Design a protein around this ligand. Structure first.
Ligand SMILES: O=c1ccn([C@@H]2O[C@H](COP(=O)(O)OP(=O)(O)OP(=O)(O)O)[C@@H](O)[C@H]2O)c(=O)[nH]1
Ligand SMILES: O=c1ccn([C@@H]2O[C@H](COP(=O)(O)OP(=O)(O)OP(=O)(O)O)[C@@H](O)[C@H]2O)c(=O)[nH]1
Ligand SMILES: O=c1ccn([C@@H]2O[C@H](COP(=O)(O)OP(=O)(O)OP(=O)(O)O)[C@@H](O)[C@H]2O)c(=O)[nH]1
Ligand SMILES: O=c1ccn([C@@H]2O[C@H](COP(=O)(O)OP(=O)(O)OP(=O)(O)O)[C@@H](O)[C@H]2O)c(=O)[nH]1
Ligand SMILES: O=C(O)C[C@H](NC(=O)CP(=O)(O)O)C(=O)O
Ligand SMILES: O=C(O)C[C@H](NC(=O)CP(=O)(O)O)C(=O)O
Ligand SMILES: O=C(O)C[C@H](NC(=O)CP(=O)(O)O)C(=O)O
Ligand SMILES: [Mg+2]
Ligand SMILES: [Zn+2]
Ligand SMILES: [Zn+2]
Lengths: 143, 310, 144, 310, 310
């Protein structure tokens, strides 16, 4: 139980460790607590990450919706929860993703990747700003 | 200013019905009475990173008919990108300090879009980017259809051949779907089918389309029969069984066609259209090519002139 | 928080706890794991800490840690009890986790597992590839 | 069984001073008294995945002098590894069900060691693995140094040329370092210096060694001048300045040479030894090549025949 | 003379059930009791016009175990056929005046049969002719199936991979079909199916066979799982979708396998057999390769030595 910072809860099993790398969260001097494969009332098993005196970038919260849709982000101040929400999915994601179209110009050239995001049913679709192709976020997140 | 002044022309997806009608109206007028000095004092880059006959030559001729000058290259092998390792980005960054507009064709999808990020106030015209988009082809196609059919709505359109890699039919299907009551017939091998993203767009607008395994199934029904070439230079090796034209149109297959039906093809053709088709009244792929001049003149005039009166 | 049974890797120097998770693939399990990063120590000042339930490390596995966290303490826990304490001693070899930096080594092209002999050289640790026999500082030998 | 019976012969670093002397002692004997049938009923694979003249032909000649048969290849291009994508491991896995020993040369370091992990009870003899080890070169070299100096202890040994990539001098330096009181002079361009693992090993045994920029410094004190070829096929493009022999020995460089001193070279030479050296009494590289027969006979004998020859 | 004395060995389709058993019976004997001099004073040509590791090296090894000498080439590029334009017929016409038997592998179907028409009284043994026949592969295969199943009758045999171009399975299926009550499962991409002349032959003998789309269906009932490599060097460019192994056997696929079942593969494998299979007790492809020595010894014995070995 931290005093001030962030608690990312309801992370799906085997995802917790990824977020640590991808967001370089452990590259800090700030105290960190992590629980992997924790028992969950609503999930059975879950991962959990606590970071003191630290808050996510909008960059980091935007990406979080893809990685872990059902995850909750808690902002704590003075030993108390102050902000609690499911991370809001954006419509553009820059830099982190790689177009799975191998003949996309985005592979050879000094530009940041960029995708337009939408759809429900099952997977969510990412449309490359460059080649205009659209893919399931399953195929894309298998970078 | 006209709606297309100083605009990049990358993808049909960014153009409205009105935008397309404007180019078509402007093309009609320029064909009727030429404006040989309309683009005087303009210098335009023609940068082709892959092969072209029709697109580059009609573009450059169109520039000259309007009085502009042309610089560029038809091969990248002697640019600094070809010999000194220069990026496309830097290439666009310097050329855009020289010219008033850039026409570009490139083997990678997205190259034209990327170019707009480095060309500042200089308009980019996509002459083709990989198997993605071919907007100026669609402009001439629409013009030709308009010419021969008197309309762009309520048509029966068959597209045949390599629909997967045909940037021509990606752009053309999108354009025709901005009009009302068109019906589409897709005749393609499975491995080279029309991509799902095009189909989904048709579904969202409530446009009828169906799949057919032969031309004869629809011959009596079609106003436009749009043939394509297998894009061998884009096939994955796993798709090499499709290199040969699966559907071959011959003069004899036209016996039950509508009288007004026209056979289109963005060209070049390999074997998908037999030479005995050329003399029939349905062949119109060369007149179609011919129309590249008026559509490309129109596009150039609209992008580089605030407004014109004609 | 305290575990009933498994291994607790205490006294991991700062910024190392995460590498150890990545390198020895410690998170590739359904077992409950608990991690503390940047904890106060006093013996070390700042430290990392890894608890893994129902999981045990052989002396050799404990030894592989010597390259990264030599002053670490490995506590074997059973029935809420510390039933054994051990410290990493430099191992003779390190297998599988590292990749030989010689591009012309047969180990890259063929279906074998990597392997290096470990020796103390000056104030460094030198790794000799079993296959190509070239020797490198541990710093320049990457993982995977 | 003799100490070397059924042993893999991969690296000098795995052998002891006693093993080396054993080979030499056996070589002496078979030279004096050939045993043309010692290896009758053996079949031995000769597998060369990069080029060879001396090593392959002398090994095969050794096999025939002892009565063994020979199978293999001098080129990997027509093996199933060359044309059908087969791994080296699978290649060794099948060959080791055919023959009684495998002699192999390969362009990647570690190849011989690998084969050892798939060859079961079939011994592998390393005819050279990339720039790593060349143990049978060292055996003949030692035999030659012994023949011409009367000893292998307390010698002054210069090694000249490409020391970084010379598998010959990696093996030979490690071997001489197993004997007492030898002294080393290393004459190399800085870019192709003797690797640090060799130098450390020498320091550990308190063996004296130093670097020199010319042959002339040490000419007066050397007993063995071991010249090498720049290993151009191993060089990184960044090391292409060193392709040309930096040190050329000519007959006039030998004025201050001890009468006992021999010039050795594992061969082939390019220009690092001028032809005028060939006629001088210090030249011994051809005699050296010939000693390959006796060293390689001995090695085959000890590995394939359980009893000490006599 | 024994039934196979001085016989050409071209196609399994030319041999009877008795011939095959004869080879196998001779193989058993020579393995138990080697006759190192049975072919003393024979010289035998080993002529390989396409790539080989197992077939060529085991044949040559067999020749040496029996005391014969060996001449030939592993590459046609330095024959007068390779450089001076000589026909295969003339090549066989001269070689057949030198040697006592000709072992040949060639990339064109029918080559072995052709050589037979120019070789006079010199027997030709087919080490593989294009995608047609591989009779000595079948001999070792049968020996292996016999060794591990105790019989060649009433077996469940799956063959997986490229059946259209697999000379191995053309020969092997024809051979097993000469025995009673065997059952076949063919697991191939449709484009590389077992040819119709094999299937017709089976129907004529009332042998049961069926097609399957996965290994898992038949895993429970198979005694022999015969995996093959996609023959990419034989493939038409139109078949390039099948280059990648469509069926990959891994150790986990073997859970429901009978304890007696063996996995065979004529080798080389690419990825159709994952390396984790190597350690499981079903893996027998390396043991299989080793049986090549005994099958090929036996064959040489019977063709070159008039009396039945015993
Ligand atoms: O003072 C606090 C309060 C809460 N937390 C941490 O915040 C996380 C969430 O805070 P809660 O514990 O209050 O959420 P909740 O379970 O009651 O309801 P759900 O979100 O599950 O629907 C908890 O996992 C707890 O570890 C602190 O670290 N410090
Ligand atoms: O700091 C920590 C460490 C560990 N845990 C461990 O996490 C487990 C769950 O703690 P929870 O507080 O999340 O229970 P929960 O009912 O709210 O679970 P949900 O339905 O919300 O998913 C607990 O069993 C505890 O052991 C924490 O909650 N916080
Ligand atoms: O499960 C946990 C969680 C947290 N911690 C936290 O570790 C920190 C130190 O707790 P320690 O128990 O390690 O104190 P220590 O004096 O033994 O430390 P050393 O000298 O051995 O290095 C404290 O911040 C404590 O809350 C645990 O020890 N165990
Ligand atoms: O049931 C237990 C017992 C012990 N532990 C954990 O074991 C770790 C060490 O248990 P120790 O009790 O041995 O720590 P220590 O400070 O007394 O001795 P040092 O190693 O620091 O010198 C502590 O971090 C504690 O959290 C459990 O997690 N569960
Ligand atoms: O190449 C095709 O088949 C269709 C289309 N063709 C053209 O644009 C004509 P050209 O290549 O001669 O300029 C294209 O996408 O390039
Ligand atoms: O190539 C050299 O210069 C030294 C050495 N040379 C030899 O072994 C002689 P060969 O290559 O003719 O067998 C080697 O490492 O291969
Ligand atoms: O090549 C194959 O996959 C099967 C078969 N393989 C062999 O005979 C083994 P090798 O080509 O090494 O002699 C062949 O037909 O050549
Ligand atoms: Mg909760
Ligand atoms: Zn893209
Ligand atoms: Zn290595």
């Amino acid at each position: 139980a931290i005093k001030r910072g962030t608690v990312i809860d309801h992370i799906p099993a085997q995802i917790g460790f990824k977020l640590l790398s991808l967001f370089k969260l452990t590259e800090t001097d700030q105290r960190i607590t992590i629980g992997l494969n924790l028992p969950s009332g609503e999930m059975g098993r879950k991962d959990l990450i606590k970071i003191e005196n630290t808050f996510l970038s909008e960059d980091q919260v935007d990406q979080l919706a893809l990685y872990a849709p059902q995850a909750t982000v808690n902002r704590i101040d003075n030993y108390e929860v102050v902000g609690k929400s499911r991370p809001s999915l954006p419509e553009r994601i820059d830099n982190v993703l790689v177009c799975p179209n191998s003949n996309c110009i985005s592979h050879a050239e000094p530009v940041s990747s960029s995708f337009a995001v939408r759809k429900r049913a099952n997977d969510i679709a990412l449309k490359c700003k460059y080649c205009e192709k659209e893919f399931s976020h399953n195929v894309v997140l298998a970078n | 200013a006209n709606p297309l002044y100083q605009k990049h022309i990358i993808s049909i997806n960014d153009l409205s019905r009105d935008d397309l009608n404007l180019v078509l109206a402007t093309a009609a007028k320029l064909k009727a009475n030429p404006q040989p000095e309309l683009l005087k004092h303009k210098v335009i880059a023609s940068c082709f990173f892959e092969a072209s006959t029709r697109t580059r030559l009609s573009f450059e001729t169109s520039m000259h008919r309007l009085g502009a000058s042309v610089v560029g290259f038809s091969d990248s092998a002697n640019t600094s990108l070809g010999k000194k390792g220069e990026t496309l980005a830097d290439t666009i960054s310097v050329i855009s300090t020289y010219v008033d507009a850039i026409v570009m064709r490139h083997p990678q999808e997205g190259a034209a879009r990327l170019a707009t990020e480095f060309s500042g106030n200089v308009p980019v015209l996509n002459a083709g980017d990989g198997s993605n988009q071919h907007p100026t082809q669609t402009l001439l196609d629409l013009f030709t259809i308009q010419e021969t059919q008197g309309r762009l709505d309520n048509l029966h359109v068959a597209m045949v051949g390599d629909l997967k890699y045909g940037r021509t039919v990606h752009s053309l299907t999108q354009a025709l779907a901005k009009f009302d009551g068109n019906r589409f017939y897709f005749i393609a091998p499975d491995a080279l089918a029309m991509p799902q993203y095009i189909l989904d767009m048709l579904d969202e607008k409530g446009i009828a389309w169906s799949l057919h395994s032969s031309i004869e199934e629809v011959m009596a029904e079609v106003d436009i029969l749009y043939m394509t070439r297998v894009q061998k230079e884009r096939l994955d090796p796993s798709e090499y069984a499709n290199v040969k034209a699966q559907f071959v149109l011959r003069a004899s297959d036209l016996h039950n066609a509508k009288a007004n039906m026209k056979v289109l093809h963005p060209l070049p053709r390999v074997d998908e259209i037999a030479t005995d088709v050329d003399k029939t009244p349905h062949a119109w792929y060369f007149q179609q090519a011919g129309n590249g001049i008026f559509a490309r003149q129109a596009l150039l005039a609209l992008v580089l002139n605030r407004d014109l009166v004609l």
